[PDB]
């Protein structure tokens, strides 16, 4: 009765125990990261050939207490190396674990290594060579809490290398995890299995080996036991031969099929070679195909399962559409099917709009992942979608009528979806305002908006709570630069469009001034209306550079168009020149619009040529114009806020209020 240990990924131990027991193992004890078990020497070779879940399988050689190096040296030498190595066998030591005496792991290894060599030097035998890459004898030692455990590694190479891929390597999913994922999938061997995002095919290949009774060790080239003198070749020959017979019959008897697809031609071609190396390639069909055009290859039945490890990665809008469309295609074409998915993004899985009936947690290196299983039978924020479809009908018609390219599709209409949706030509921005539940609710709003607009995930930009392609856009006759992703705002406030169009009509032969100019869109409108000159002032160099670029865009360059970088309040206090048309649109907040607007109109009065107009805007909620103070200043104010409110901003209840201030 031999005593063995198999290691695995944390989370797989119970699966491992069942598998070990099924192939004959007795007296199994799960422990953290592995499974102690026992069996005769046949059972040892049988477990090496047949375990799909084990990382390594090992033969414990002993164990000792480790204070002082000496304990360790002495502990190691209690084992009879000289007559366990076959002559010429190379070796390596893997040491993990630390304590007070062994403070470094490579020290741990070096010491064991010396102790083993000194077992040979002592008997006037030649020193065994250490060979890190492919030793014939690999010895593991695991130091935990003053005890050191020594084992011979019978795997050699880790057992996930079935022999159908590559010693190096780095697969997103190790072959052992893949096997687990298939076992947990609810997939029934003998029924079709399909993976529409298959990458290199590992999930499909593990399923086909497992279904066709094809042993994980069948195609390996190397084991840990071959340099070991207690090695029993006759027994290993029996296991080997039984493996062959079982594989030949499983493959020949199999009647279902495997379907894999990916949009990447390069991985499909690796998947195809991998499947073929695994002996199983006649049972799988790989094609280069996008999930979008995914069809059920058996529309008349039998039902099977769809299994997959979708991407998760921003590319959020694209990923949401991907998960969302997958869900839609499942329901449409795979009615009756079992679905199982392995992801690092539960939020993305929620986009399928299916309720999982089973779920598993698993680590895939340093990344938490779930696997969820779904059964597909045989409306996703109706609320929000409804208002959107309708707003789209109303505003699309309106925009085309009005010759406008950039407008608000949705402005927090429903208080339970607190988002803005803006259209800029072919693009779309959604701005989250204020509130996993919430993220999924955001995903649902994005999924829905994409669906309702019939747009293209590429062209939606999400700017939320928490490399700049600028876009050329029109506003009536003006052309403007926007940047949809890089700044707090886009370079264009759409609700002011009518005031801007008004500046345009009022402008021929006029000296125009624009204060708190931001990106200067209003200056562009005034310049195209035949301003005789424009002066555009703002405190931000970035925003004036953009202003300038907007002017350039409309052929408005040269001596007649000035941009000035100043605090506008000081520039007002100090300026001499006069203007026919002053557009002024300050921030609400040493300046408060409510308190200060009167002192503003005082200074602005001296800048205002006889006959001129000032157009004054602000967006303070409950702004009161001091009409009394204006009349004192020999000024009159005419409110045009209604005349300047645009339809896409009507049911807003936030208010840009607007005034034409003139003389007496």
Swiss-Prot record:
It is found in: Cytoplasm. It is an enzyme of class 2 (transferase). Disulfide bonds: none annotated. Keywords: Cytoplasm, Methyltransferase, RNA-binding, rRNA processing, S-adenosyl-L-methionine, Transferase. Residues 387-664 are annotated as: RlmK. It holds the Pfam family THUMP. Residues 1-386 are annotated as: RlmL. The keyword Methyltransferase applies. Residues 43-154 form the THUMP domain. PROSITE patterns: THUMP, UPF0020. The keyword NADP does not apply. One of its GO terms (cellular component) is cytoplasm. Its EC number is 2.1.1.173, 2.1.1.264. Belongs to the methyltransferase superfamily. RlmKL family. Specifically methylates the guanine in position 2445 (m2G2445) and the guanine in position 2069 (m7G2069) of 23S rRNA. Methylation occurs before assembly of 23S rRNA into 50S subunits. This is Ribosomal RNA large subunit methyltransferase K/L. It comes from Escherichia coli (strain K12).
């Amino acid at each position: 009765m031999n005593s063995l240990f198999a290691s695995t990924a944390r989370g797989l131990e119970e699966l491992l125990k069942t598998e070990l027991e099924n192939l004959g193992a007795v007296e199994c004890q799960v422990v953290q990261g592995g499974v102690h078990f026992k069996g005769d020497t046949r059972l040892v070779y049988q477990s090496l050939m047949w375990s799909r879940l084990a990382s390594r399988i090992m033969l414990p050689l002993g164990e000792c207490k480790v204070y002082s190096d000496l304990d360790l040296y002495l502990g190691v030498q209690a084992i009879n190396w000289t007559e366990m190595f076959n002559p010429g066998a190379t070796f390596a030591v893997h040491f993990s674990g630390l304590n007070d005496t062994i403070r470094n792991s490579q020290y741990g290894a070096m010491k064991v290594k010396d102790a083993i060599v000194d077992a040979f030097t002592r008997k006037n035998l030649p020193r065994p060579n250490v060979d890190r890459d492919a030793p014939d004898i690999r010895v593991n030692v695991w130091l935990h809490k003053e005890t050191a455990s020594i084992a011979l590694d019978l795997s050699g190479d880790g057992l996930h290398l079935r022999g159908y891929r590559d010693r190096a390597g780095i697969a997103p999913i190790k072959e052992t995890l893949a096997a687990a994922i298939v076992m947990r999938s609810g997939w029934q061997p003998g029924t079709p299995l399909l993976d529409p995002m298959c990458g290199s095919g590992t999930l499909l290949i593990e399923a086909a080996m497992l279904a066709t009774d094809r042993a994980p060790g069948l195609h390996r080239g190397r084991w840990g036991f071959s340099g070991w003198a207690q090695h029993d070749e006759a027994i290993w020959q029996e296991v080997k031969a039984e493996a062959q017979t079982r594989a030949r019959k499983g493959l020949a008897e199999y009647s279902s099929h495997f379907y894999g697809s990916d949009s990447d031609a390069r991985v499909i071609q690796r998947a195809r070679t991998n499947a073929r190396l695994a002996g199983i390639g006649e049972l799988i069909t790989f094609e280069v195909k996008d999930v979008a055009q995914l069809t059920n290859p058996l529309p008349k039945g039998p039902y099977g399962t769809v299994l997959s490890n979708p991407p998760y990665g921003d590319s959020e809008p694209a990923l949401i559409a991907l998960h969302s469309l997958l869900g839609r295609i499942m329901k449409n074409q795979f009615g009756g099917w079992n679905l199982s998915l392995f992801s690092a993004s539960p939020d993305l899985l929620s986009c399928l709009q299916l309720r999982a009936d089973k779920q598993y947690k698993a680590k895939n290196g340093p990344l938490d992942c779930v696997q969820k299983n779904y059964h597909v039978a045989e409306m996703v924020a109706e609320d929000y979608t409804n208002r959107l479809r309708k707003n789209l009908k109303k505003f699309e018609k309106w925009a085309r009528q009005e010759g406008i390219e950039c407008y608000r599709l949705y402005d927090a209409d429903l208080p339970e979806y607190n988002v803005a949706v803006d259209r800029y030509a072919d693009w779309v921005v959604v701005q989250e305002y204020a509130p996993h539940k919430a993220r999924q609710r955001l995903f649902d709003i994005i999924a829905a908006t994409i669906s309702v607009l019939g747009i293209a995930p590429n062209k939606l930009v999400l700017k939320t709570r928490e490399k700049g392609e600028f876009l050329e856009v029109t506003e009536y006759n003006a052309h403007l630069w926007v940047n949809l992703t890089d700044y707090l705002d886009t370079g264009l406030f759409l609700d002011h469009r009518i005031a801007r169009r008004m500046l345009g009509q009022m402008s021929k032969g006029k000296d125009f001034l624009n204060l708190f100019s931001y990106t200067g869109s209003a200056t562009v409108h005034a310049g195209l209306g035949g301003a005789r000159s424009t002066t555009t002032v703002d405190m931000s160099r970035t925003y004036l550079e953009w202003a300038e670029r907007n002017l350039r865009l409309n052929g408005l360059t040269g001596r007649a168009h000035r941009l000035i970088q100043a605090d506008c309040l000081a520039w007002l206090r100090e300026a001499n020149e006069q203007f026919d048309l002053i557009f002024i649109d300050p921030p609400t907040f040493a300046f408060d619009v409510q308190r200060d607007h009167l002192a503003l109109m005082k200074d602005l009065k001296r800048l205002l040529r006889a006959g001129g107009t000032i157009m004054f805007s602000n967006n303070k909620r409950g702004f009161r114009m001091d009409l009394d103070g204006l009349a004192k200043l020999g000024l009159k104010a005419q409110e045009i806020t209604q005349k300047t409110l645009s339809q896409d901003f009507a049911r807003n209840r936030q208010i840009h209020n607007c005034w034409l201030i003139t003389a007496a």
